[PDB]
Structures are given as structure tokens and as C-alpha cells.
Design a binder for this molecule. Structure first.
Ligand SMILES: NC1(C(=O)O)CCCC1
Length: 271
């Protein structure tokens, strides 16, 4: 019974309360198809989880003949390396920390495959190809990471991302993006929800984040749109501890799904 850890992140993983009898409300898609849901414990009581990643998990479990139990990451984070003591060895938090500690056997979430994480865990082939993009108010046009309003910032156009995120780290390490980072570090938000709200409230002109997330957020709000070319393209993959016996088949299934329309069907169903 594999321990699956995930996190709230629509449309990949929705999190809702169970009904009074402890079950998940029976719901259907706009075309009458049943919405598959799994019970996921977390911040701790049983809750209802569903979405792109849950549909993927259900498919993998069926295809690979395994049972599982899902829980939401305890600290509500994806995972970054942080100094937590006087030693010289940083420690991973979020889902990365849980996978490495054994609290989880697989990370099933919109987790970016990057260099730092790849140094400690292994990933399946990507179940989603995306990259960083920009969220702005309808009518605003930004070409991409090279747009002057970003490279030559001023207070007339404020942009930012989420503090302590892997995206924040991406800019902090990009020497060529020092100018941008200096500007962002002065406006970064505590959470994506807050930043997205700030964009609708005209308090923030641009929010830099995952295109896989922003494309959905934009589709849900008419006053919001994504703009420009993607930069820092990346994939989302299932995380497992090194040398896992599940890796090969998880990867083969995902590659097969990209080739047989299954992944395209999830795209249409959830966005
Ligand atoms: N995909 C993210 C990650 O850290 O894995 C990047 C920002 C949202 C979460």
C-alpha cells in the first residue's frame, strides 16, 4: 500500500471536505461523466481529492496493480532546501522532505523536475510539459522574459512571484536576471492565491508562475490572461526515491499516455 503525498493545486488536485457521512459528494462533469475522487488525509482529517493528478494516480494504480493511500503534505509545501540548524547540511521541506524521510513513497503533484531536486530523488518521465509564464490583467501585453518592462523595471509596472518558491530561487540564481530579482524581492507575495488576487485588484501588474497553473487560472477569470512566450520550460513528474522499482513502469505508462491520447483527454477534462 504505497503512501502517496500530494498538495492542493487546481486543476491538478482539488481538495474539498467530505460529506457528513464521511464520503465524497457524487459529482459529474459537464458532459455527464462521473468525477473520480479519492479520500486524502491531511491538514488531520479525511478530505476529498480529485483532478488531473488524481485521475493520473488512479490510472497508474490500475495499470501497475498497486494499492495506495493519499495524504496532503503536512507543511503545505512542494519542497526546497533550507538551513534548519547550525550544521552545514540543509534539509528538504515539503513533499521532497516527506519522500526522502519515508513519509511518502511517491510524490504525485505538479512538481517541477529541476536540477536541485534531481540531485536527491528521481523523477518519472514528465506527465505535463510546461514552463514559466506571466499572468496579467486582460489588455496587458508582455512579450516574455525579455520584455523591457521586466528587464528595465520601474514602479509603473510591478511584477513578482511567490517568496521562498522554486521560482523565486530560479531568479535568485540567474545572474543574468539580477535586475529583475532585485525588483521582485521587493514585491514577492506570500502565496500564489494572494498574488493572483493582487493582479485582479490592480495592485500587481504581473505574476510570474507555472504556465500549467496560470493557464488554468486565466481560463477561470475573464479579467485575467497569460501573456508572452514561455521561459524556463520544464516538466512535471512523479517523484520517487532513487532506484525505485516503480520508476520504469510509471515512466512507460506516462509515455504511453502521451502517445495514445490519454494525456490529451486529461487536459480536456480538467481545463
Ligand atoms: N511547480 C512548482 C514547484 O516548485 O514544483 C513551481 C511553482 C509551483 C510549484
Amino acid at each position: 500500500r504505497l503512501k502517496i503525498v500530494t498538495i492542493h493545486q487546481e486543476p491538478f488536485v482539488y481538495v474539498k471536505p467530505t460529506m457528513s457521512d464521511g464520503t465524497c459528494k457524487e459529482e459529474f462533469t459537464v458532459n455527464g461523466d462521473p468525477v473520480k475522487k479519492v479520500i486524502c488525509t491531511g491538514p488531520t482529517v479525511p478530505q476529498c481529492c480529485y483532478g488531473f493528478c488524481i485521475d493520473l494516480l488512479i490510472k497508474l494504480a490500475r495499470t501497475m496493480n498497486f494499492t495506495y493511500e493519499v495524504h496532503l503534505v503536512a507543511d503545505g509545501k512542494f519542497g526546497t532546501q533550507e538551513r534548519v540548524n547550525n550544521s552545514n547540511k540543509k534539509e528538504w521541506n515539503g513533499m521532497m522532505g516527506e519522500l526522502l524521510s519515508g513519509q511518502a513513497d511517491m510524490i504525485v503533484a505538479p512538481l517541477t523536475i529541476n536540477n536541485e531536486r534531481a540531485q536527491y530523488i528521481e523523477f518519472s518521465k514528465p506527465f505535463k510539459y510546461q514552463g514559466l509564464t506571466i499572468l496579467v490583467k486582460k489588455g496587458t501585453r508582455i512579450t516574455g522574459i525579455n520584455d523591457p518592462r521586466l528587464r528595465n523595471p520601474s514602479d509603473k509596472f510591478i511584477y513578482a512571484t511567490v517568496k521562498q518558491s522554486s521560482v523565486d530561487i530560479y531568479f535568485r540564481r540567474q545572474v543574468e536576471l539580477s535586475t529583475m530579482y532585485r525588483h521582485m524581492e521587493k514585491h514577492n507575495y506570500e502565496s500564489a492565491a494572494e498574488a493572483i488576487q493582487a493582479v485582479r485588484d490592480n495592485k500587481l501588474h504581473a505574476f510570474i508562475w507555472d504556465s500549467a497553473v496560470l493557464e488554468f487560472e486565466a481560463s477561470q477569470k475573464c479579467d485575467l490572461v497569460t501573456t508572452g512566450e514561455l521561459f524556463f520550460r520544464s516538466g512535471f513528474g512523479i517523484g520517487m526515491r532513487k532506484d525505485s522499482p516503480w520508476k520504469q513502469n510509471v515512466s512507460l505508462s506516462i509515455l504511453k499516455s502521451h502517445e495514445n491520447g490519454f494525456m490529451e483527454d486529461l487536459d480536456k477534462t480538467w481545463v
